[PDB]
Structure formats: structure tokens, C-alpha cells
Amino acid sequence: HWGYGKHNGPEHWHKDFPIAKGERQSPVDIDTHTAKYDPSLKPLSVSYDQATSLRILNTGYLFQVEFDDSQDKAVLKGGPLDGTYRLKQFHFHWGSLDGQGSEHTVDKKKYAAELHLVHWNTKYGDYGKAVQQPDGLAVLGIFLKVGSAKPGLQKVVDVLDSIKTKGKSADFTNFDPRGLLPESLDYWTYPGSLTTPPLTECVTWIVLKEPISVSSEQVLKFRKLNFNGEGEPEELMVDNWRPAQPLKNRQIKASFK
Ligand SMILES: Cc1cc(C)nc(Sc2c(F)c(F)c(S(N)(=O)=O)c(F)c2F)n1
Ligand code: NA
Ligand SMILES: [Zn+2]
């Protein structure tokens, strides 16, 4: 099965998932000089006031925090988006070293980690139908740099020891994802894909320009997770990022400056 190692990592995925070599793959390098300012884009509307977190899960490839998306609670709209996208979950990708870990890059700069807030287009009724559609998902991407602690991240960090291994979950209620947002909602946007198998080309990417700051100690706790299941040889969950893929004809649009 797929993973991040030499044997089953990103350069192998195309054999099971040929769309890996498709025309709208993610992530990409954001060339800030060739991104076009688009004065017709709207400010992002992030309405997370009624978000209902439920659970945190080690999937074997990352960890994710899941939300109750059975009603229009937390939603993303505006920006490049037509209609309303409902928050389903967030997760992170990160490095073995502070110098790497993000999936998107900015002028080839890698960040220590990248947060993905995943939302589905409510015109498609649920997530499983939305992922079959070319405008099914909107993923809000936020870079993490190592510096000051992010207080809003600590509740996540502190629960990771209870989900060390693949398939472990824990109750994770009353978590407010607004605590993970930077001050500015200036962004880049482009059409792309899931960054893990099945690599479906169903994502409108919205990548915030301003990274959030996390402490070295917070990210080191991400690196103590395990890709393996309990009772199996320990493989640290690090470097679970896909590298930049070819932009091909696509244009990246900037909301700013
Ligand atoms: C592959 C898969 C299967 C299922 C059932 N949910 C998901 S949710 C999800 C996910 F885990 C991800 F890593 C991504 S990502 N990196 O943001 O493209 C995603 F969009 C998602 F929508 N992903
Ligand atoms: Na409900
Ligand atoms: Zn992701």
C-alpha cells in the first residue's frame, strides 16, 4: 500500500493512481512573482463560530480532527468559491526537521508543516459525492513555521500521546479551529487535487500567505506519532508530505497586493 517511504512514497503512487501524473495535481510551488493579483476575488468568509469538533484520529498517514458536518455549522465561502463549503476535518503534514514538512512551497521555501482545513461543496449533499466532482472540495492551507507557540494548537498537541498509533482515536469535543488561523486572510488560489491517494482532481486550493508560528516543542510532539499500528515495529510519523508537482498550464491567483 501507499505511504511516504522509499518503497511506497510519492514517486510510486502513479502505479495505483495514474492521475498522479495528471494536469491539476497538488501541491505546487507558489511563484509569488508570477501569481496574478485578481481584484475580482472576494475576501474569504470563514465562519467557524458554530464548529462542532468530535474526534481526533491517527489514520496511519497523518492525524485528523473531525467535525460534525451533518448541518451547516462551520462553513467557508467567498473568495474564488461559488456557493458554500462545509468544514469536515483538519489535518497536518510535517517534516523530520524544521526545514521541511509543508506540501506547498513559496518561491521554493518549505515550511515546517502545513495545516489543511477540508471543506466540501454542500451542492453535492455529502463529502463522498463531493469528492467525485471537479469543484467538490475547498482546502484551506496554512503554513506553520517554528517560533513562538501557538496557544490554540496546544489542546491538539496534548492529546497526541493518546493516539500514538494507526487506527487510534480519542474524543475531541469543543475545539475551536479559529485558534489556528493567522491574523491575515490574504491568500493564493488555484485548481488542484488531493495531495494523497487517490489524488483526485476535486480541490480548489486556498493557501494563506501568512504562516502561523508554532513552537519547536509543539512540532516535536507531532513527530512522536507513529505510522504503524500498536504492536508493530515503530516507524515515526515524519515527512508525510507530497513534493511540489508540475503546475502545467495553471495560473495561481493572489487576493492581494
Ligand atoms: C483520501 C481521503 C479519504 C477520505 C475518506 N477522506 C479524506 S479527507 C482528506 C484528507 F485526508 C487529505 F489529506 C486531504 S488534502 N491533503 O488536503 O488534499 C483532503 F483533501 C481530504 F479531503 N481523504
Ligand atoms: Na445532525
Ligand atoms: Zn492534507
From Swiss-Prot:
SUPFAM superfamilies in the record: Carbonic anhydrase
Listed cofactors: Zn(2+); Co(2+)
pH behavior: Optimum pH is 6-8.
Effect seen on changing L194F: Normal activity
Pfam families the UniProt entry points to: Carb_anhydrase (PF00194)
Phenotype upon changing H91Y: In OPTB3; partial loss of activity
Effect of T195 to D/E: Strongly reduced activity, but enhanced zinc affinity
Activation and inhibition: Activated by X-ray, histamine, L-adrenaline, L- and D-phenylalanine, L- and D-histidine, L-His-OMe and beta-Ala-His (carnosine).
Effect on the protein of changing E114Q: Strongly reduced activity and sulfonamide affinity
Phenotype upon changing W2A: Impaired activity, not rescued by 4-methylimidazole (4-MI)
Site (Involved in the binding of some activators, including histamine and L-histidine): residue numbering on this chain: Q89
GO terms (BP aspect): angiotensin-activated signaling pathway; carbon dioxide transport; morphogenesis of an epithelium; neuron cellular homeostasis; positive regulation of cellular pH reduction; positive regulation of dipeptide transmembrane transport; positive regulation of synaptic transmission, GABAergic; regulation of chloride transport
Disease: Osteopetrosis, autosomal recessive 3: A rare genetic disease characterized by abnormally dense bone, due to defective resorption of immature bone. Osteopetrosis occurs in two forms: a severe autosomal recessive form occurring in utero, infancy, or childhood, and a benign autosomal dominant form occurring in adolescence or adulthood. Recessive osteopetrosis commonly manifests in early infancy with macrocephaly, feeding difficulties, evolving blindness and deafness, bone marrow failure, severe anemia, and hepatosplenomegaly.
Name under which the protein is recorded: Carbonic anhydrase 2
Source organism of the structure: Homo sapiens
Encoding gene (name): CA2
